[PDB]
DNA sequence: CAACTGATACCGAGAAACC
DNA sequence: GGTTTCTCGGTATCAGTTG
């Protein structure tokens, strides 16, 4: 129970992942690059990697085993995050896209 | 337990298209295991859980609202967790147009 | 139907709640 | 002690939009 917020947390604190950063000294607020797959910015390793390693975490891809399927660990990790209660999108604040997501208590 | 029976007499009955017997044995059979859409025979597919909520009285007509997705649940997750049926993954079919899941009767 | 989306239907694991 | 429902935290499909 409750993987997501721990390890979104551990995610950016990894710093593996350019852009995604805290945006405040209090960890309560991050960004999030947000690039789409079709436009020419779409460096494949590095703005799919968070989706991938979302998707490896919870044993939903397997490497040598299943396909890759970058836009499923696209829509996988955007509905998780509506749907939970940890993060709320900041979306008036939200060529480099992001999102911006503040954690609530 | 009042599910085991209960089903195979809503099988025998045959009241519910897709949810056949698959052998003259009494033992393994289908049920249809469709995805509603925002509805498209939304009460013919909704009535094996509606049958299921009215019997075991969780939905009185005239007191509760209808609610066709926690129907379907509660017989889906009642179905899996159940001990007297077990689910032939091998034989179920959720890549057709009518899919369907098979289970076998166990006995006791 | 490529990638992407919100809204909604759906699912399994315990945790209750019944029986 | 034995079945069925409830909770929860995600995941999947639908009916479009290009977010």
Redesign the pocket.
Known sequence: ?????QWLIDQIDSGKYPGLVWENEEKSIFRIP?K???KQDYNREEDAALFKA?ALF?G?FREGIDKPD???W???????L?????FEELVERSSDPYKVYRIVP
Request: with cysteine.
């Open positions: 129970n409750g993987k997501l917020r947000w789409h797959a079709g979302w919870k939903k970058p836009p499923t696209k829509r996988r990790l955007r509905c998780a509506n749907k939970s209660n940890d």
